[PDB]
Amino acid sequence: HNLHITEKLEVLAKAYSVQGDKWRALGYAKAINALKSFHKPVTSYQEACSIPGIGKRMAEKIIEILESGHLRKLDHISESVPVLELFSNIWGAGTKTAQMWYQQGFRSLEDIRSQASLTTQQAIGLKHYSDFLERMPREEATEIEQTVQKAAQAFNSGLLCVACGSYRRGKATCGDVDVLITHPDGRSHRGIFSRLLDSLRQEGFLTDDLVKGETKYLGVCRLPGPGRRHRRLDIIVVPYSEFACALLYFTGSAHFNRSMRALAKTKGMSLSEHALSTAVGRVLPTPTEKDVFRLLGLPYREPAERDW
DNA sequence: CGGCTGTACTG
DNA sequence: CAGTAC
DNA sequence: GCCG
Numbered sequence: 275h276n277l278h279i280t281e282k283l284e285v286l287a288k289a290y291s292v293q294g295d296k297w298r299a300l301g302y303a304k305a306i307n308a309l310k311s312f313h314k315p316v317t318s319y320q321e322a323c324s325i326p327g328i329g330k331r332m333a334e335k336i337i338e339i340l341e342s343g344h345l346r347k348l349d350h351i352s353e354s355v356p357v358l359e360l361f362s363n364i365w366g367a368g369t370k371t372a373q374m375w376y377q378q379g380f381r382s383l384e385d386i387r388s389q390a391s392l393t394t395q396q397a398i399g400l401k402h403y404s405d406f407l408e409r410m411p412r413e414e415a416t417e418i419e420q421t422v423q424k425a426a427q428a429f430n431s432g433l434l435c436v437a438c439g440s441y442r443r444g445k446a447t448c449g450d451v452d453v454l455i456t457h458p459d460g461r462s463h464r465g466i467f468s469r470l471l472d473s474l475r476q477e478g479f480l481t482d483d484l485v486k487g488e489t490k491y492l493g494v495c496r497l498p499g500p501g502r503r504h505r506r507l508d509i510i511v512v513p514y515s516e517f518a519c520a521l522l523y524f525t526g527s528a529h530f531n532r533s534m535r536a537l538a539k540t541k542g543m544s545l546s547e548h549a550l551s552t553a554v555g556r557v558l559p560t561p562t563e564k565d566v567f568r569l570l571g572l573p574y575r576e577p578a579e580r581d582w
Numbered sequence: 583c584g585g586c587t588g589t590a591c592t593g
Numbered sequence: 594c595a596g597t598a599c
Numbered sequence: 600g601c602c603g
């Protein structure tokens with residue numbers, strides 16, 4: 275993991291990200307995910323271009339870090355960037371909102387609180403600003419999953435509730451909990467969603483709602499008792515017929531999903547949380563996750579092997 | 583030159 | 594729709 | 600940014 279170059283790149287990568295240059299930030303993200311994986315630290319400016327994810331521009335930049343010791347572009351990073359990052363860490367506010375607030379003269383969360391116009395979601399994000407920057411211990415994610423499962427299985431004991439995301443990928447900490455809910459009978463998943471949230475809300479577990487769709491919920495919960503933080507909770511309810519693809523999707527990682535979906539498109543297919551399809555298409559049968567891998571000509575990967 | 587994943591709330 | 598998010 |  276020879277990475278004294280990456281450190282300086284990530285500063286630039288972050289800068290592009292918060293300023294909304296998502297594609298350049300994407301290039302940097304992949305160039306960096308590479309350097310933290312090359313066996314022996316990079317030596318030659320040719321050793322660079324001989325790596326997947328690094329080209330003429332990135333290579334010559336790496337050659338500036340090694341040779342010179344520091345990259346000059348860093349010195350041209352707008353001074354607004356730290357403030358933009360602060361604002362964009364409010365849930366529900368992205369690059370465009372942060373830049374607008376910044377143009378309006380706002381510089382601190384006190385400025386936002388007192389003077390900014392906030393959406394319903396942003397007001398919740400700001401209230402829980404600190405909490406939402408903390409990742410929870412794996413054990414707390416378990417407790418949250420079980421709270422949801424216990425409350426759901428009370429409408430129907432056959433309902434499957436499974437924590438996906440970083441949890442299923444085996445991480446020691448989780449930014450939130452992602453709970454996928456279904457029923458193996460392909461039908462009992464219906465007419466449950468709204469009742470579930472109502473009971474979780476009734477028992478004081480759900481504290482705030484961010485997004486409420488027909489089959490997806492993004493919100494905020496807090497386990498009972500002292501010393502508890504507010505945690506983000508996302509729930510989706512899917513018909514059993516879509517279980518494997520939904521599980522695959524909601525497990526990720528995000529970068530893994532993107533790569534897998536890109537691959538599917540090259541093979542004349544389309545992959546979503548609903549189905550693996552032939553391009554516009556026929557829905558290919560995917561009873562299990564393994565079926566999706568096999569249809570794409572891929573060796574199966576355990577969730578921990580998908581942590582990209 | 584131009585895609586870089588595919589989907590779904592909010593207002 | 595643009596913006597934000599999973 | 601990267602790559603085809």
Ligand SMILES: Nc1ncnc2c1ncn2[C@@H]1O[C@H](COP(=O)(O)NP(=O)(O)OP(=O)(O)O)[C@@H](O)[C@H]1O
Pocket residue numbers: 438439440441447448449450451452522523524525526527528531532599
């Ligand atoms: N941009 C995306 N494209 C495709 N799938 C995504 C994307 N973003 C999130 N997902 C899927 O939704 C799941 C939850 O997204 P999350 O935003 O919850 N990220 P996750 O990996 O769980 O990490 P932390 O909660 O511990 O920070 C991800 O693991 C992916 O499986």
Ligand SMILES: [Mn+2]
Pocket residue numbers: 438439440441448449450451452
């Ligand atoms: Mn998550």
Ligand SMILES: [Mn+2]
Pocket residue numbers: 439450451452508599
């Ligand atoms: Mn999530």
Ligand SMILES: [Mn+2]
Pocket residue numbers: 402405502503504
């Ligand atoms: Mn709190």
Ligand code: NA
Pocket residue numbers: 361362363364365366367368
């Ligand atoms: Na945000």
